[PDB]
Every structure is written in structure tokens, then in C-alpha cells.
Amino acid sequence: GSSGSSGPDADPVEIENRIIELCHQFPHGITDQVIQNEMPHIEAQQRAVAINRLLSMGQLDLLRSNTGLLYRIKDSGPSSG
Structure with a gap:
């Protein structure tokens, strides 16, 4: 908001x-905590903003798993035929 x-x-x-470079480093995803240790200087809104942005932009992929959400590199699986 x-x-x-x-x-x-x-x-x-x-x-x-920055998040992109990370999403790249971590194919499984990255937890807010991570970005925190990676950029504990960033702002709460800034952190989210960028996130939300990437989320929308279509560069970052959100993954709701266990406590908190996860963020990985956006992509789509290959077709079967």
C-alpha cells in the first residue's frame, strides 16, 4: 500500500x-529475511515497492510457502509437445 x-x-x-540478481542466485526463491541480510539498509516500503514492482513487472515470481512469502526468478516450464 x-x-x-x-x-x-x-x-x-x-x-x-538487486532483487533480480538475487532471484538469479537463488532459483528456489528468496525470503524477505534474505533481502534483509542482503540489504538491511533498504527501506520497508522500498523493499516491498521494488518487490511489488518486480512482481508486477513480471521479473520476480512470488511463491507463498510456509511462514512468509518467497520470491524467485520468473519463468515458465517447457511444453510437453
Whole structure:
């Protein structure tokens, strides 16, 4: 739930891209906690924003499993025939 402008704090694209690089490192996915240890400097809204963005953009894939959600690299399985 975006709330007002964020501000000049760590560009968005950058944040997103960062997540991408991660989503790449982890094919299984990445937990908010991870991104936290990876970027504990990022903001709550910034972290989500980028996430939501990637989610929408179609670059990041959300995966609801166990406590919290998971985020992996977006992709689609190959056809059978």
C-alpha cells in the first residue's frame, strides 16, 4: 500500500535490479529475511515497492510457502509437445 512519495533513497530500479540478481542466485526463491541480510539498509516500503514492482513487472515470481512469502526468478516450464 504505497504511501506518499518515498524520496531520494536508493533508486528504485537499482533496488529492483538487486532483487533480480538475487532471484538469479537463488532459483528456489528468496525470503524477505534474505533481502534483509542482503540489504538491511533498504527501506520497508522500498523493499516491498521494488518487490511489488518486480512482481508486477513480471521479473520476480512470488511463491507463498510456509511462514512468509518467497520470491524467485520468473519463468515458465517447457511444453510437453
